[model samples]
Target: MGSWAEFKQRLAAIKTRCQALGGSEAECAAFEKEIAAFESELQAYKGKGNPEVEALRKEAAAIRDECQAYRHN
Candidate 1:
């Protein structure tokens, strides 16, 4: 099989294993809440030479690369 198809098949296996490993809708909801709280806390700071600010800036840059992973087509 082609690399794309093989890659997709591997991802499908991972998804199936994740569901079998007790992944739940309730946990997904909880994760959403936690992510929102994290974003809110991350947004709370402004104007600083502190480590927190530097860390958040680094995370923002990483997320920019994350965003580029999506397919455009």
Candidate 2:
């Protein structure tokens, strides 16, 4: 339903926030990997209908949930 720019902006915003937090090298790297994976999945769903986008969106949401569970401390 949304445009790729919106999805890309979200991914970029998270990445910027993650960077600003100054997480550990390893933690940042891991998060970066996950973010990239999510972005890639997002890219793959481009041009398709809502079904594929929704699926990738759910997957990205789950990944975000897991990432949110982490405490920087």
Candidate 3:
């Protein structure tokens, strides 16, 4: 996906957008928790310099896709 910092930034932005859309605080908090967990897990292989980076990249991409789905026009 992106650098750990980038993922954090994107997740933060998503949380803001979701909150703006009237998502419940609990829901936003849960999402933030999930992102934090994912980012923590990602630190395990943050700079392996291998194809694995792409796998994490896909994880970020999937989250982005989900966020787009939630945009609700």
Candidate 4:
């Protein structure tokens, strides 16, 4: 996918997974803030493919796993 589309899709996955994680209000709110930050990151990058984008993408990967720890069994 294109850089912009990839970011868009990943952002949606991030939001949906966070919502369904079945965590506390505070925990969910924290992820909400984190997702906002990620959205800001995407805005800052403006869909450009750069070395910095690679770092952000890895950060994105890391956050996805972080969200994994909060789900129901």
* Index of the highest-TM-score prediction: 4
Compose the digit string of candidate 3's lDDT tens values, residues 1-73: 4564776566666556654656654565455457646645665665644565455555554554555566432
| Candidate 3 lowest-lDDT run of ten | 64-73
TM-score, candidate 4, is 0.39
What digit string (tens of lDDT, one per residue) describes model 4 on residues 10-47? 66666565747655646655665676577567657665
Across 1-73, the per-residue lDDT of candidate 2 in tens digits comes to 4565666666666655564645565665566577757756665765444565665566465545545555433
Clash number for model 3? Answer: 2
The superposed Cα distance between candidate 3 and the true structure at residue 5, in angstroms, equals 19
Model 3 spans with C-alpha error above 4 angstroms: 1-20, 46-73
Task: Quantify how close model 2 is to the true structure by its C-alpha RMSD in Å.
Answer: 9.0
Q: Tens digits of per-residue lDDT for model 1 on 10-44?
A: 33443343334344545434433443444345455
lDDT (0 to 1) per candidate? 0.40, 0.58, 0.56, 0.60
Off by over 4 Å in 1: 1-21, 47-73
Q: Which structure among the candidates has the greatest lDDT? A: 4
Of 3 and 4, the candidate ranking higher by lDDT: 4
Instruction: Output the lDDT of residue 36, model 3.
Output: 49
TM-score of each: 0.35, 0.38, 0.37, 0.39
Question: Model 2: residues >4 Å from true position, as ranges?
Answer: 1-13, 48-73
What is residue 14's positional error in candidate 2, in angstroms? 3.8
| Candidate 4 colliding pairs | none
Instruction: Tell me the lDDT of model 4 at 67.
Output: 61
